Write a structure and sequence with these properties.
The chain is α+β, with helices and mostly antiparallel strands. It has one domain: Glutaredoxin. It is built from eight helices and five strands, in the order ββααβαααααββα. The protein has a five-stranded mixed sheet, with helices on both faces. α1 packs across α4, α2 crosses α8 and α3 packs across α7. The two termini are about 15 Å apart. The PDB classes it as oxidoreductase. Keywords: disulfide oxidoreductase, redox protein, dsba, oxidoreductase. It forms a monomeric assembly.
């Protein structure tokens, strides 16, 4: 067929019940994730081709960048609670990988302050048990699929995107191929 298991996607040996329909994992330390966000706008282009009724979830992972990776996962938990994903994603990426000005929890915090989230609002969120369970969720979802690399996308808990099996000569072609595949998996 035109779409084949092991070619544009793989199948989980161990399907995950109750999983988000479209589930994406990343890390601010992950260089391809930088590309995926900054250059390719994968998340947005997928969204654009998804049917109505579909919910799109994006979670951070711990296994890159040691102590600061976990901090980054708690901070993405803060971003999700406050609804400020779209204001911090880019300065966080550029702060970890481009300028390298993110070295501690406090520098992470500065990105939020500079993006207009208030100190008290960030620090309350940071310490809330709503953020604690949000962190727990991010970890549960990753642990459920035995996640060992990012970027990663999972559809309906059963299919995993395999971008190494798509063409990378043209960036635009890679993205539409990627997105059309998510759409195909969606309907499956």
């Amino acid at each position: 067929a035109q779409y084949e298991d092991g070619k544009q996607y793989t199948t989980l040996e161990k399907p995950v019940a109750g999983a988000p329909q479209v589930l994406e994992f990343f890390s601010f330390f992950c260089p391809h994730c930088y590309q995926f966000e900054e250059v390719l706008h994968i998340s947005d282009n997928v969204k654009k081709k998804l049917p109505e009724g579909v919910k799109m979830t994006k979670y951070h992972v711990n296994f890159m960048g040691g102590d600061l990776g976990k901090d980054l996962t708690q901070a993405w938990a803060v971003a999700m609670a406050l609804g400020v994903e779209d204001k911090v994603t880019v300065p966080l990426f550029e702060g970890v990988q481009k300028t390298q000005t993110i070295r501690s929890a406090s520098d992470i915090r500065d990105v939020f302050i500079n993006a207009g989230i208030k100190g008290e609002e960030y620090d309350a969120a940071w310490n809330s048990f709503v953020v604690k369970s949000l962190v727990a969720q991010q970890e549960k979802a990753a642990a459920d699929v035995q996640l060992r690399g990012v970027p990663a996308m999972f559809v309906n808990g059963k299919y995993q995107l395999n971008p190494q099996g798509m063409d990378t000569s043209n960036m635009d072609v890679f993205v539409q191929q990627y997105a059309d595949t998510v759409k195909y998996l969606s309907e499956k």
